Design a protein around this ligand. Sequence first.
Ligand SMILES: Nc1nc2c(ncn2[C@@H]2O[C@H](COP(=O)(O)OP(=O)(O)OP(=O)(O)O)[C@@H](O)[C@H]2O)c(=O)[nH]1
Ligand SMILES: Nc1nc2c(ncn2[C@@H]2O[C@H](COP(=O)(O)OP(=O)(O)OP(=O)(O)O)[C@@H](O)[C@H]2O)c(=O)[nH]1
Ligand SMILES: Nc1nc2c(ncn2[C@@H]2O[C@H](COP(=O)(O)OP(=O)(O)O)[C@@H](O)[C@H]2O)c(=O)[nH]1
Ligand SMILES: [Mg+2]
Ligand SMILES: [Mg+2]
Lengths: 430, 50, 431, 430
Amino acid sequence: MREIVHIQGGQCGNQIGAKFWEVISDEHGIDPTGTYHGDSDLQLERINVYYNEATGGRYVPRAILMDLEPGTMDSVRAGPFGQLFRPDNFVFGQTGAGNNWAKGHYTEGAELIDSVLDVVRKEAEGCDCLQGFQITHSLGGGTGSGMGTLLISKVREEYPDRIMETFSVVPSPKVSDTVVEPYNATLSVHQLVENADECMVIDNEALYDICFRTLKLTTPTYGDLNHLVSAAMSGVTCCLRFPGQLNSDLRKLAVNLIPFPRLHFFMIGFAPLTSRGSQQYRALTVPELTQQMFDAKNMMCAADPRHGRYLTASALFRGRMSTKEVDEQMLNVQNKNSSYFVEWIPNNIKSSICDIPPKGLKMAVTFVGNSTAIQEMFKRVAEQFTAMFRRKAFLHWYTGEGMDEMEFTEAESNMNDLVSEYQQYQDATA
Amino acid sequence: HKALKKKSDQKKLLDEIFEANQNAILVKQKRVQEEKVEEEKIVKYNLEKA
Amino acid sequence: MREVISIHVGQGGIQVGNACWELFCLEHGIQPDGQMPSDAFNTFFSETGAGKHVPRAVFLDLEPTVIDEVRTGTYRQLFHPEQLISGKEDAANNFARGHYTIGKEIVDLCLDRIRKLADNCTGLQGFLVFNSVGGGTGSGLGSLLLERLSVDYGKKSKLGFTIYPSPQVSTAVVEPYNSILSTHSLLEHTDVAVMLDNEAIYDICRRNLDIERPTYTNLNRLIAQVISSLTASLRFDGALNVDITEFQTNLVPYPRIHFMLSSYAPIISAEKAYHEQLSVAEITNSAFEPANMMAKCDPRHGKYMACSMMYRGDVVPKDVNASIATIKTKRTIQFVDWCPTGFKVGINYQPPTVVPGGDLAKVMRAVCMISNSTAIAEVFSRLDHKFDLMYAKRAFVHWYVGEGMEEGEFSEAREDLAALEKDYEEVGIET
Amino acid sequence: MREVISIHVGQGGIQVGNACWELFCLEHGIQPDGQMPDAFNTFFSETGAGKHVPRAVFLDLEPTVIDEVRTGTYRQLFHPEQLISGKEDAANNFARGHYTIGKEIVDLCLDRIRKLADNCTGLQGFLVFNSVGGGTGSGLGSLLLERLSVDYGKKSKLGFTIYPSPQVSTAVVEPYNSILSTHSLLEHTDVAVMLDNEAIYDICRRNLDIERPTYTNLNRLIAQVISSLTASLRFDGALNVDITEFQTNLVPYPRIHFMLSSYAPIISAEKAYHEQLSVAEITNSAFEPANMMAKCDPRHGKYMACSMMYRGDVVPKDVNASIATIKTKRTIQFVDWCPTGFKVGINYQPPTVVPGGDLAKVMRAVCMISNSTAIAEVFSRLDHKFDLMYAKRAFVHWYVGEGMEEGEFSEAREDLAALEKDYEEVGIET
Ligand SMILES: Nc1nc2c(ncn2[C@@H]2O[C@H](COP(=O)(O)OP(=O)(O)OP(=O)(O)O)[C@@H](O)[C@H]2O)c(=O)[nH]1
Ligand SMILES: Nc1nc2c(ncn2[C@@H]2O[C@H](COP(=O)(O)OP(=O)(O)OP(=O)(O)O)[C@@H](O)[C@H]2O)c(=O)[nH]1
Ligand SMILES: Nc1nc2c(ncn2[C@@H]2O[C@H](COP(=O)(O)OP(=O)(O)O)[C@@H](O)[C@H]2O)c(=O)[nH]1
Ligand SMILES: [Mg+2]
Ligand SMILES: [Mg+2]
């Protein structure tokens, strides 16, 4: 009931899901062979949300893995918990798009996406009660940034009533790994703003900063980044698959977080994250953990939240708690930094509680914040895009595969507009 | 077991196809020798006629 | 319980029958003495009751040198003493001499031997005949034997493996006359006629086998391999068997057009076949390559009518169909309009055998194709031109007039050749 | 299931293909006879048993090198009918090799190429090696490129041309055929890498400490560069790059497709291990103006793009930290319309070392392919040298007598002038 099905495409999305389902399997006590081995009875009563049942008591992932190249999926199948995924859901191409949005969205992806759409519709129809869809993708890769939003569009006209969330990795100017990142980020954002019910921005540079400074570990890795992303993702639905004092689904979050339909790009935070040396130091308490949550330094993004005012905030507390000083601390935080809170929305913080804490931790917080500081990533991406496009640099692939500069101009105008009205309400006064 | 059977059959076929190459390593050496023998016969013909 | 009778007449016919008989004996395991070193042999051999095997072959010649060589060779104890018919005077490349003067006194003994051999068989599939067309005695004796057999037995199938002269390479100077006469004789009397010219095989040996100074033995061995590939289906178990009677059900649309040309694959030196996989696709591409054709003709100059092709080894029917699909997709090969499908396929499990001291090696996959196409009119046209060039001045006509042949015999052969060419032209046009 | 076909034409092309083929065999563990005592599929094909037939073709009209190869220790490795050998050498005449005697060989070459390509199913593209200062090599390479461009069409082709040194030359008529081949390949080659000999001589003298170098050392360095370029297709890495993922990141405009390569580190075993060979110092040595294999000064022009591949146990945060320092450096400046110009690739496999060679092994290596606007100097000096002899129509009769028209040089001169004007127009800021 009210279950959701996983769809991942591209190398980044596949490697995110690889750690996500390892985390969820460890959370539910499922062995890598799909056999339940948990200790608490509750570990199975809503295990159906992310797993389908097969004969023999075995549990199968409801995840569809799709890519234009088979290397990443062939590599992850050999990794831990990789045998869980159904081979039928794996769909791969034989050519590749070469980080080109035009190739990944016009020539190869349109022809290839038929089979993955077939498996998606089959899985969605098989579900008892459809709640929504979740996608994980990176905006720095052209092929992924193409077919991810393409599948978003063609799932959108088909299921207009269901909810959808995307976890988008945008290319930051600090850590750059591809030079055509502005182009494909532009083309991906232009389509994502139109159809994304929810989008959650994630920055690898901010991941690097937090792993450098919070955990104080010498050698960070993509595995640690994936673990953080997976924990954050699971915190979004924690109260959905285990009981809490306040049941608050993704659509609860949608109702309470988005004031106007086009403002659906949010920032994620998780707590606690303590260094091994200071893990035995910290005095795990609700006030300290929530103040650690609202620090600008806990975010996984580059937009300094103290450079703007939060439109709204949402906190998902996880563990066995009571609500009293939770509420009073929410009130204290809203009163103390009232300058950083836009005034025409009184009580602009939602609180929810899930009774079971995370595995390995007695108390945790997942924070989602809609703030007026997010304009910065869009502004820098647009600046790079216009600097690289004013001289028509590397535009020749995009022109040679059926797409023209008029679409680029429309996209640039669209996100310039979007930034305009998204900043507009920051200065609005009652 | 099926993969093992197919791999073993293929591998035996490989050891069998180590073979209409070595044969005319030998045979092509023989053909070059026979062309040289024709040249030697031409030389003998020229010497005897002279 | 199936048998076939082989006829070898002429010097080339005897030299190729000998070559095919070493290969058959080696394949069946029969020692040169005919004994058993230690029941599929029943197709080619017959049991005498205890011990040796008697091949179902007959040899004919009016020149006794080759017969004496065979009777003094290592195979003296194999053949029956009184089935190697040898005359006294050679026809000396004269078709009339062998058709009207001295072949008539020998054809009676030949028919006696043929009926004596046929009385033993109970499931006689048919007759194969080998004869050089560029020789007067061979052509005359073959024509007379076909004439007598067609009335003695009637509907029994006969297949003729004729070795036509090369377009420009020739040994004699009067061979066009007897070639045209024999073709006229056999057109209405041979059910299947395979072209086996020597220049194409020379080029094949030079290119693939890398043989620069060849002899007749290699040519005869290649012909023997082709015959073995054709006849292995009758004596070896296969997933898809084809009989001799199942040939001009599929290869001969009209009774007049019964001349076809053969090819074999992989006809390659034993130097670059281990170092490649010998995939069915590449072997059937090599077989269909125009340069690999065993007859000196260009298939690109005419349409294809039919192709009956046999695989031997561990081939897969799925792979065969996949290769046929690629061949059909290929644009350089086009079939006639009234033939949507023209491929007949046969499958046999027995791999080809290798002769010690030979050129070919042992392989696990082989294919032999027999194609009837409309491009064969070129050899008939050039033979007609060569015949006319000498018939304009009535050159060498007295040598045939003085042997009992009438003057008008050449005119009817010329008219038959013209009618045959017109028939090919009429068949080759689309509807 | 990915394949690439290599073409080697000319004496230098054959001598460098041999060198790259010892290195590939050693890296894949293939014996000189070929017998092994599945990543090889990129460069080799399963010939059934033991050995692996390289996906390479050799062409030459002078049979000495072909006979040497067929009589060397690698006689059993190469197929004989792909080592096409003629009878008469072109004697450094471009017209002889392009109009007179190469036409009877190009048909067999195309037949061999078709036979080799029919086996491949995931053909990535073609690489070609040819000495530009040789008539037969230049003519055959030009003819093969023109034929392949219409035979296959959109298949990628990369040419590793060895341009003559600014002042060091072996022949006296090489500028003519160099300009002719450049004119031919400008509209026919997708990527062209400069590999002049004087820069490699300087590298060997300064770093390898060799006072008497030969062609074998240059060929070994070129082979190492090729292996560094192509290791991504056959070795697992945290960030893979394909052949098709090159001229979205190195070629802004179709006309500008000439670039230069650099490699690091280059040091002998006698003093290699006295220093750590850190990622920062190796990437600084690679960017040093004295460490290119092309004799050009990058300080005389702007940088357009750089795609660099690291092999070893690199850390992406270390890569980003080094790139940040390079960007901070003032002596290296990028063009105005390029905010980010760095592309990074990561591979886990360390470079292999050949016994008896000059280079010592490294657990850390970097190879950069850079396109910059400073390459106009070599074109200008080649144009000046060509004009000096074309003023008096010197050596023109030797080409006129081989079927070549008189006006063929004028259009090549105009194309060179237009290309230089295009570089000048691109190099100015907005
Ligand atoms: N392929 C092939 N053809 C042969 C061979 N021997 C003879 N021929 C052909 O036969 C023609 C001449 O006839 P021969 O076979 O020599 O002798 P014949 O057929 O008995 O006729 P006569 O010469 O009159 O005795 C030549 O033009 C050859 O083309 C052979 O061993 N192999
Ligand atoms: N780097 C390098 N360049 C070479 C080598 N061998 C030849 N060259 C270059 O090739 C040019 C001359 O052409 P060659 O390679 O000797 O021979 P070719 O290309 O086949 O042309 P022809 O001389 O007409 O046969 C010289 O100017 C060299 O710059 C080599 O081993 N290494
Ligand atoms: N956290 C994390 N990020 C990654 C990983 N691999 C790649 N990325 C990011 O993804 C971007 C490149 O994405 P790409 O591989 O081209 O996506 P694709 O084109 O869909 O395959 C880079 O900028 C990286 O920052 C990983 O293992 N972990
Ligand atoms: Mg005779
Ligand atoms: Mg040379």
